[PDB]
Amino acid sequence: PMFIVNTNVPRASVPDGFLSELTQQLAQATGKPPQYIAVHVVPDQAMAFGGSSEPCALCSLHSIGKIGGAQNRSYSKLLCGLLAERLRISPDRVYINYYDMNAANVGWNNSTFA
Amino acid sequence: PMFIVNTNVPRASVPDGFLSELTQQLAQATGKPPQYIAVHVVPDQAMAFGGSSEPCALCSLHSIGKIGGAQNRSYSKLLCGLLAERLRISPDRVYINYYDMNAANVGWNNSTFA
Amino acid sequence: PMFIVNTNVPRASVPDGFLSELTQQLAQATGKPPQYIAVHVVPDQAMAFGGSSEPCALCSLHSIGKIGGAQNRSYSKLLCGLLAERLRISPDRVYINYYDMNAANVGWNNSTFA
């Protein structure tokens, strides 16, 4: 799985250790070994949510399965909880788009997962 | 809905006001209150379109419905028009990918839109 | 087609000519005309792969067709090979997400490809 966060929160306000905490909590949440989890955090962005430039986040989670109704509500509570705790962003100023990827449409290591 | 613009136009050429203008124009165009519209503009990117580094943009528009053949033509005319007028980019150097997102695959406020 | 690369490799390690090589090789692999190929490279990113901050990349390839099982394995071989040779990134620290885009869902030049 791959988790990407784009935020207007400044780089100085992203705590040390955040990439590792995202990797650990996503490995646990998805029930996958951490060797499979990629994370990416992009601060200092020019973005607005509902016309306001108060802290906000636009994020994505891609996974080959383990995506769906109840699972996504659980991911949202975990990930908004981390973004509120670590980056001080309110949960109602966060969007996370979930993508169930087909194994044939994920490349890695010169081939795909198919 | 969520609109993202990535462009090689430099940061000083993006007008103050452009994020607000996009928020209002998209609220009008999607029929959704502006409180729901998230916008994000990333200038200074290393990109090319047809091998050329003339001003160009790679964009995406995600919405829970309000996505389809004739709606997408109208969004492309609206959004290319804003990009040409404000960032001086040729409409034929712009790509906009449209995503009709399932409510259960958009997280927000600790849960999803389902 | 559009190919995006996000990486933690520093901007100074991305060689001159990389965007043009990706454009040409993408045209060679997809058979699509170079004039319509877009490429985008984002270095200096805060990202981890498998809990490690060794060089890695998260990428995406969008194309209106020319996407599927055998084609995607071929693209992964080509693109991991360019990232290893030019950015010194190990192929097993690269993810590439592939998207077969509906022509109606790709805006360009005030309209769509539908």
**Domain map of chain A by residue range?**
1-114
DSSP B89: -
Q: Which residues contact B107 (CB under 8 A, 6 or more apart)?
A: A59, A72, A73, A75, A76, A79, A80, A94, A95, A96, A97, A98
Please tell me if residue C73 touches chain A, with a CB cutoff of 8 Å: yes
Q: Would you say the C-alpha torsion B60, B66, B72, B76 has a positive or negative sign?
A: negative
In this structure, the strands spanning C57-63 and C94-100 are parallel
Phi, psi of C8, deg, nearest 5: -95, 0
DSSP C64: S
**Cβ contact B99–C112 (<8 Å):** no
State the burial class of residue B70 (Cβ atoms within 10 Å of its Cβ: 0-12, 13-18, 19+): exposed
Q: What is the CA radius of gyration of chain A?
A: 14
- Dihedral angle, C-alpha B1, C103, B46, B81, nearest 10 °: -60
The angle at the Cα of B23, spanning B18 to B28, to the nearest 5 degrees, equals 125
Annotation-wise, does A32 bind a ligand? yes
Q: Could you count the other beta carbons within 10 Å of the beta carbon of residue C83?
A: 25
Q: Could you tell me which CATH number the domain at C1-114 has?
A: 3.30.429.10
Q: Which amino acid is at B37?
A: I
Q: What is the CA radius of gyration of chain C?
A: 14
Q: Which chains touch B (3 or more CB pairs under 8 A)?
A: A, C
The alpha-helical segments, DSSP class H, found in chain A are 18-30, 69-87
Experimental method used, please? X-ray
DSSP A15: -
Per the CB < 8 A criterion, the answer to whether A11 and B4 are in contact is no
In this structure, the strands spanning A38-42 and A46-49 are unpaired
Our answer to whether residue C15 is catalytic in this structure is no
Please tell me if residue C112 touches chain B, with a CB cutoff of 8 Å: yes
Longest dimension (CA), chain A: 43
